[PDB]
Amino acid sequence: MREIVHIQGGQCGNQIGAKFWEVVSDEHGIDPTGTYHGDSDLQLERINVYFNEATGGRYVPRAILMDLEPGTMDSVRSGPYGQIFRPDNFVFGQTGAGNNWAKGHYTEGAELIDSVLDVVRKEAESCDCLQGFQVCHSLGGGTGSGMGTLLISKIREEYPDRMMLTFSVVPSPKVSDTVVEPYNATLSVHQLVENADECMVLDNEALYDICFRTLKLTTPTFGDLNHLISAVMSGITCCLRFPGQLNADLRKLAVNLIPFPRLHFFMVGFTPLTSRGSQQYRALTVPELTQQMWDAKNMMCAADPRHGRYLTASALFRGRMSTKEVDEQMLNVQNKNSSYFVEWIPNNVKSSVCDIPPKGLKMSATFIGNSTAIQEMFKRVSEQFTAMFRRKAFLHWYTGEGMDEMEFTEAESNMNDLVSEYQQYQ
Amino acid sequence: LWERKIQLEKEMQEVLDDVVAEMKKEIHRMTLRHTELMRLQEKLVSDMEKALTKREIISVKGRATAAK
Amino acid sequence: HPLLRRAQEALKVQFEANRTRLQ
Amino acid sequence: REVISIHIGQAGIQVGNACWELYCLEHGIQPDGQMPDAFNTFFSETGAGKHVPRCIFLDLEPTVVDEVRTGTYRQLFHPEQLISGKEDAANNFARGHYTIGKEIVDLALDRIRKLADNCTGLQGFLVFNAVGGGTGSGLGSLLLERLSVDYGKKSKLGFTVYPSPQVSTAVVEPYNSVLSTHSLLEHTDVAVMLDNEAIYDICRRSLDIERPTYTNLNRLIAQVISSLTASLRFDGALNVDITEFQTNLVPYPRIHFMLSSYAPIISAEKAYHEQLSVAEITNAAFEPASMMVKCDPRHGKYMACCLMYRGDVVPKDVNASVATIKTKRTIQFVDWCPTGFKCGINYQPPTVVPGGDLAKVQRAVCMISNSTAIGEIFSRLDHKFDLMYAKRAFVHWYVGEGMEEGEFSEAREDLAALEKDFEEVGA
Amino acid sequence: REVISIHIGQAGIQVGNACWELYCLEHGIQPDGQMPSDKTIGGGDDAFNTFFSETGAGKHVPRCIFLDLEPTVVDEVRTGTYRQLFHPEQLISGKEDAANNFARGHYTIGKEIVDLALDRIRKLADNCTGLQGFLVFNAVGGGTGSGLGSLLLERLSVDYGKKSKLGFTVYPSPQVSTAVVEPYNSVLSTHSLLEHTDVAVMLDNEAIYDICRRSLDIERPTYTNLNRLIAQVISSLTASLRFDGALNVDITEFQTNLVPYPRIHFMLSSYAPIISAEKAYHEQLSVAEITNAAFEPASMMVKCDPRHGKYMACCLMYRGDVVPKDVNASVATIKTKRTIQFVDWCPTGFKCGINYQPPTVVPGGDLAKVQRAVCMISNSTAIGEIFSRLDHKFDLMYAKRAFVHWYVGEGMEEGEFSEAREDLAALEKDFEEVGA
Amino acid sequence: REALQREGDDLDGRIRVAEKEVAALEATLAQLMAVNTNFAASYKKVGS
Numbered sequence A: 001m002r003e004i005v006h007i008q009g010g011q012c013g014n015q016i017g018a019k020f021w022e023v024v025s026d027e028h029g030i031d032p033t034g035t036y037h038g039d040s041d042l043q044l045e046r047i048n049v050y051f052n053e054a055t056g057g058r059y060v061p062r063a064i065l066m067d068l069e070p071g072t073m074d075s076v077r078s079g080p081y082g083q084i085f086r087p088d089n090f091v092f093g094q095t096g097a098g099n100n101w102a103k104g105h106y107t108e109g110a111e112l113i114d115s116v117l118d119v120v121r122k123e124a125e126s127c128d129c130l131q132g133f134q135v136c137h138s139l140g141g142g143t144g145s146g147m148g149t150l151l152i153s154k155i156r157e158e159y160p161d162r163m164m165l166t167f168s169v170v171p172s173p174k175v176s177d178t179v180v181e182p183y184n185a186t187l188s189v190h191q192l193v194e195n196a197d198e199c200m201v202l203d204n205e206a207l208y209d210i211c212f213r214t215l216k217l218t219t220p221t222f223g224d225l226n227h228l229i230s231a232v233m234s235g236i237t238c239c240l241r242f243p244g245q246l247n248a249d250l251r252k253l254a255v256n257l258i259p260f261p262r263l264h265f266f267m268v269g270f271t272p273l274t275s276r277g278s279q280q281y282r283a284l285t286v287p288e289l290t291q292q293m294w295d296a297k298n299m300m301c302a303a304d305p306r307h308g309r310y311l312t313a314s315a316l317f318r319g320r321m322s323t324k325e326v327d328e329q330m331l332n333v334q335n336k337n338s339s340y341f342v343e344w345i346p347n348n349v350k351s352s353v354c355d356i357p358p359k360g361l362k363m364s365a366t367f368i369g370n371s372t373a374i375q376e377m378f379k380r381v382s383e384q385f386t387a388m389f390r391r392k393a394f395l396h397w398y399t400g401e402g403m404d405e406m407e408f409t410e411a412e413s414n415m416n417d418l419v420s421e422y423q424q425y426q
Numbered sequence B: 001l002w003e004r005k006i007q008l009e010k011e012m013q014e015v016l017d018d019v020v021a022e023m024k025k026e027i028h029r030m031t032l033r034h035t036e037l038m039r040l041q042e043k044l045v046s047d048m049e050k051a052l053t054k055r056e057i058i059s060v061k062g063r064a065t066a067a068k
Numbered sequence C: 001h002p003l004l005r006r007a008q009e010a011l012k013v014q015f016e017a018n019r020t021r022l023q
Numbered sequence D: 001r002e003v004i005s006i007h008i009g010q011a012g013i014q015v016g017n018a019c020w021e022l023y024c025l026e027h028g029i030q031p032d033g034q035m036p037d038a039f040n041t042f043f044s045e046t047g048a049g050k051h052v053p054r055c056i057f058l059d060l061e062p063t064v065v066d067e068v069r070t071g072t073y074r075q076l077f078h079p080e081q082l083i084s085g086k087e088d089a090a091n092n093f094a095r096g097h098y099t100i101g102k103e104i105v106d107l108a109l110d111r112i113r114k115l116a117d118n119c120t121g122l123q124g125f126l127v128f129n130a131v132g133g134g135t136g137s138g139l140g141s142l143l144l145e146r147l148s149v150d151y152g153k154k155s156k157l158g159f160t161v162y163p164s165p166q167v168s169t170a171v172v173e174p175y176n177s178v179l180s181t182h183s184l185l186e187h188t189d190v191a192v193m194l195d196n197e198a199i200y201d202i203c204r205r206s207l208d209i210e211r212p213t214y215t216n217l218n219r220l221i222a223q224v225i226s227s228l229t230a231s232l233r234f235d236g237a238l239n240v241d242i243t244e245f246q247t248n249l250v251p252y253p254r255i256h257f258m259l260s261s262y263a264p265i266i267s268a269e270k271a272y273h274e275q276l277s278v279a280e281i282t283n284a285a286f287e288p289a290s291m292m293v294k295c296d297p298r299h300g301k302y303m304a305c306c307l308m309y310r311g312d313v314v315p316k317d318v319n320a321s322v323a324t325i326k327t328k329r330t331i332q333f334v335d336w337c338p339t340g341f342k343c344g345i346n347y348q349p350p351t352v353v354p355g356g357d358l359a360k361v362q363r364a365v366c367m368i369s370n371s372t373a374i375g376e377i378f379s380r381l382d383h384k385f386d387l388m389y390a391k392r393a394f395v396h397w398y399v400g401e402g403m404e405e406g407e408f409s410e411a412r413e414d415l416a417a418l419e420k421d422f423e424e425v426g427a
Numbered sequence E: 001r002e003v004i005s006i007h008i009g010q011a012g013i014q015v016g017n018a019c020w021e022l023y024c025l026e027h028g029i030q031p032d033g034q035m036p037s038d039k040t041i042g043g044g045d046d047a048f049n050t051f052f053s054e055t056g057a058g059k060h061v062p063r064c065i066f067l068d069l070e071p072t073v074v075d076e077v078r079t080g081t082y083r084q085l086f087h088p089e090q091l092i093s094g095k096e097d098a099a100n101n102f103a104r105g106h107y108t109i110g111k112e113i114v115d116l117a118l119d120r121i122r123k124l125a126d127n128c129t130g131l132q133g134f135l136v137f138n139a140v141g142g143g144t145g146s147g148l149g150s151l152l153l154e155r156l157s158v159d160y161g162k163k164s165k166l167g168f169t170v171y172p173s174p175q176v177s178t179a180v181v182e183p184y185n186s187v188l189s190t191h192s193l194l195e196h197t198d199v200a201v202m203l204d205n206e207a208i209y210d211i212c213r214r215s216l217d218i219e220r221p222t223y224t225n226l227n228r229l230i231a232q233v234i235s236s237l238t239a240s241l242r243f244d245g246a247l248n249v250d251i252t253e254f255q256t257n258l259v260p261y262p263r264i265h266f267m268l269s270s271y272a273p274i275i276s277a278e279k280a281y282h283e284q285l286s287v288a289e290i291t292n293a294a295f296e297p298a299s300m301m302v303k304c305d306p307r308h309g310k311y312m313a314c315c316l317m318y319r320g321d322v323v324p325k326d327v328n329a330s331v332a333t334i335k336t337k338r339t340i341q342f343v344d345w346c347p348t349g350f351k352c353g354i355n356y357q358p359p360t361v362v363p364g365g366d367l368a369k370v371q372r373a374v375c376m377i378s379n380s381t382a383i384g385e386i387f388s389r390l391d392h393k394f395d396l397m398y399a400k401r402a403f404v405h406w407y408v409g410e411g412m413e414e415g416e417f418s419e420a421r422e423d424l425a426a427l428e429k430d431f432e433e434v435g436a
Numbered sequence F: 001r002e003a004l005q006r007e008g009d010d011l012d013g014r015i016r017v018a019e020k021e022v023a024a025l026e027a028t029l030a031q032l033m034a035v036n037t038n039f040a041a042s043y044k045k046v047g048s
């Protein structure tokens, strides 16, 4: 009944979404060929949120891959679970933006975006009751930033009352992959602030710190990062699918978190995370879940919450629990850390429970906090963007493609008068 | 003769080739202004839905007042 | 303008239903 | 996804001679063009089971191309892509550019056109020449203008064998190089310089070669080009293309001159013993002793660098090594580049080329940087050009060919303006 | 649906000697009038109907009339490698030479041999069941080809009339030339050819030399090299009747869709791909680039730039396995191509014939075995320049009455000289009035 | 160079019609709020 279409923008977004689908397929019990091979019927009770039925029981995903080079499409197809995807929606160009916000917002999206809107319209009126949209992308690149933000603008202009969830890999300059990450990131946040409705901030620095400390991994690949991100990606939308003693719809979360219209960037976390050599030596109780969940070195962002204040927090538990215990733990936390939580919002934490855990774990939990620390994360990018902008470096590659300097100055002004409200409410 | 031809060519190709840059700047800035036009249209849409909601609420309020 | 008419038509419908009930 | 290779002059033709014999064995294609889709960027399938390279070899003197026609790859190339003039340019820029160039450059263009027509998804061009001589300088400065005015929007990666200060075979290089670098400044887009003396020193130190001929050098540059194009030929966890590279690096329109480096440039006897990993291969690439142009990276601040990792490299040790190199104070980045690295990775190990001393290694780094250190290069070559031009020496050949005395002055002022630009952006 | 062939003059009979070899190779006929005993047949028992006829026991004989006055090449054929193939009577050799003289070719010696060749033509036609048309092969620059050829054309028009005629005639080149008195013969034969031959196809010695120099990589070509690709062109033209064509064009499509006005029938010819073994397997032969090379001006058998004129109409015969989508896209690309321009009064002007037979290969030849080939016959308006240049050559000779006594010593007057002149002038005027 | 100026003139005209749209939107919104507040005040007053 409730519905979420999925869109995968760019190389990083495509990879994250591919792992996310290989995770959700397991959580719902299907083989990579597409059929159903599971144990319970509560798996398929409510798979209409992400799946579509074909003639023969071949379930396909309500997903739209998108990029500008065929290489990522070929890699996704080559990887396992690349068959379930509907071949129709693999929209792609040929030139590639080449980390050029101009070539992702003004040149290649000039033509490919009519086709991608046609596909998303097909998918949207294929279902009956849309609840929201989902996008996976990275603001530090060039074909996931301009292309993703223009897609968000198109969908916002088209469907006004169907909100979007965007999972944005914000470029933290402790991981360096390209030079123009702060040209792309600020210019994408310029529109993400006003158009989208929720943005989960993720980052490779914190993901690497997690895989180093908590997972006790020696050599983790991008697969482990994507498998970790899939945890929150498939935990935010578990109240939609499985029954709960206290449901939490996506708009439930939106209302309970977002205090003011301009503040919809959230920091996420997943619990329990454990190494193969300590899983045997630890137990699993709700207090343990809470203390591992709130630990600042577990958040998947470059923003230590002790530097900031939790405006509104949210917890999503999965598995058989005790609601009195859950509420007692949350009020214990809000009474102990009585300085971080804002004073004019009593009981800043909203909890919710669901009756089905992730496959394998007896209990689990996901954390979503609207902390005001992220003003540091955004100033850390704004000052770098200004650092290059002062001496006019790498700018003609945008100016010669129609984009004036007014756009850059306005983007900087909006990035400034976002952290303005963060500080004002801190 | 060949020297005169070369002089003619270099002059005519030096004159062959920036105000169009500023004019196209004006064009793109006005394209931004018409994105603002679309913004005005969506503001009109918002006012329209607000008018609908206000009429519904006031009609139900009048029904309630008649009920009381 | 025509967009105002769509709101005016809904108002007309609600008033017509009210009047029919009163009849 | 395509780039077409044009070789001009003896240096470029021989560099391509090594480069193509590298590619053929890296893809598995026999000399006479048959397997026993990654080749699509370079080789095009023609007929059945036959592959032809997307290249044209061009020179005025015929014997250098006759070497290719009579070698072991005689079946490989299209029998017409091996162009030949009739009389050598005689290391005279004016003679190569004006007098002889007209009859053959139109043929070159009319062949490039049909190569591009055979191609569909072209990225662009890669050209090979040396700015020291006359052929590869005049013909280069004419052909590049022709392509920049015909195709215009394409990217022309120019790998130029720039002449070294001390070691120098020719004698009119101070003239030929400035006459070439007038055009090369404003007609190509990325100009990767290479210096014979620097690569000689690299061969002497790393490979303990005390008689380094041109063959080993040519194999080395071939490996560099293969590492550059591997991201397009194959797949990797973190890739890079022509637009990627060329809009990430070039800060301003008139600052594009790469410094190239490679690692591990190690023979078999040391490669079997000494261990290899990313966190020390990256520093090894940055060391001045292993940079391919006779320049001093210490004097000039770095502006933007690009790294490419062939072989099994996970994307975390590259991050760690970038951290552990940016933490060293000896190398200074430019003030306005808070992040100055673009990293790319692959899944294929470098292929050992039989007939050489290069090792068969698990992983390798190719580094292409853009830094203000190259100002002294232009300054010193212009100084020796001034030395030669003070007494109007050697000007009579060019004057008789047709070039006046004032274009030398305009080109010299162009080089001076280039040096001023580098100083201003260093400030 | 048989087609008969007439070869007149030394050039015509040499082209026939180098072309009937191609036919007998295409239809697998041994070079003595028989098929090999073993089944080595491409397919069908009537692909050879148009050129041969079984007689009791596998003894095929070509439908050819090799008519020539001076018997040095006719008997060269008679003693060549084709003796048990040709019909002993078809090979008509006269008594003496024509000697570049239209007079001796058309009045003195011609009158006593036309009525001897005509009876053989009549016997061949009566034997034929579904006769399609005539294919004439001749040289206007000589005596027998021009004189005897024109006489035979006139005396076949007077008799059969309705049947179509395709005249492959060679002209002198603008600069390269062998005969001295060739302009006179050219204009005299052109007047006769104008209103009798239904469709005139043009060839030029230098225009084939330069193609064999730039494409086949031969710096010393010869007649035995030109005639092979002339045979290739005529085979590409005639393959539609022979082999099963998905989109095939019989002989009357040329006249139906490529002769908008009866006066206007003069056509450039092109043939792609002209490639040898060395570069054949290195290049890729595709319907885009073969067609583009067909429509480039550097691959025409008539030395004339099509730029100076406007392509009135065109026909493209495709051999080999070609899928019609690519040829449709190719003609679309041509219509979008800038340099070549059409008269605006013809919106559709591309006939696209296609067959299912790949081009053949002759042992010891130059061209290699290829997938597909294309023959482009274009009714353009650049041929008026050819006629005008030939006329300007003729004027200087005629002004001084040079060589005229040799002509007028026979039945030729000066009235027909003047009338041929004014006929060429009228052709010039017609072509120019077509204009824009 | 002058065709881009022609496009500029077209965008001048579009700017003018945008101004007219601004005026119409302002009039509609102002009348909306005025009538709505008066009507709501009337129906909060009469039934008391």
Ligand SMILES: Nc1nc2c(ncn2[C@@H]2O[C@H](COP(=O)(O)OP(=O)(O)OP(=O)(O)O)[C@@H](O)[C@H]2O)c(=O)[nH]1
Binding pocket: D008, D009, D010, D011, D012, D014, D015, D059, D061, D088, D089, D090, D091, D130, D131, D132, D133, D134, D135, D136, D137, D161, D163, D164, D168, D169, D170, D196, D214, D217, D218
């Ligand atoms: N790497 C490399 N460089 C070469 C080779 N041969 C010549 N060079 C360089 O080319 C520079 C001068 O160019 P030339 O030797 O004149 O070659 P060219 O420019 O093609 O001149 P031409 O003889 O007219 O063809 C010299 O300073 C050499 O450093 C070679 O085989 N390999």
Ligand SMILES: Nc1nc2c(ncn2[C@@H]2O[C@H](COP(=O)(O)OP(=O)(O)OP(=O)(O)O)[C@@H](O)[C@H]2O)c(=O)[nH]1
Binding pocket: E008, E009, E010, E011, E012, E014, E015, E069, E070, E097, E098, E099, E100, E101, E139, E140, E141, E142, E143, E144, E145, E146, E170, E172, E178, E179, E205, E223, E224, E226, E227
């Ligand atoms: N392409 C080509 N042209 C030929 C060949 N043989 C003769 N010609 C042409 O024929 C022209 C002259 O005509 P002739 O060859 O003498 O033919 P003809 O009409 O029989 O003249 P006579 O032999 O004197 O009766 C020359 O200009 C040649 O161009 C040939 O084998 N190939």
Ligand SMILES: Nc1nc2c(ncn2[C@@H]2O[C@H](COP(=O)(O)OP(=O)(O)O)[C@@H](O)[C@H]2O)c(=O)[nH]1
Binding pocket: A010, A011, A012, A015, A016, A099, A138, A140, A141, A142, A143, A144, A145, A169, A171, A175, A177, A178, A204, A222, A223, A225, A226, D237, D238
């Ligand atoms: N989770 C994940 N992140 C990736 C992967 N590949 C690249 N990234 C991240 O994506 C960021 C850059 O995005 P990029 O691919 O350049 O964007 P694009 O060029 O527009 O497609 C880098 O900081 C990488 O850390 C992957 O496979 N998984």
Ligand SMILES: [Mg+2]
Binding pocket: D009, D010, D011, D133, D135, D136
């Ligand atoms: Mg040389």
Ligand SMILES: [Mg+2]
Binding pocket: E009, E010, E068, E069, E070, E098, E142, E143, E144, E145
């Ligand atoms: Mg004769």
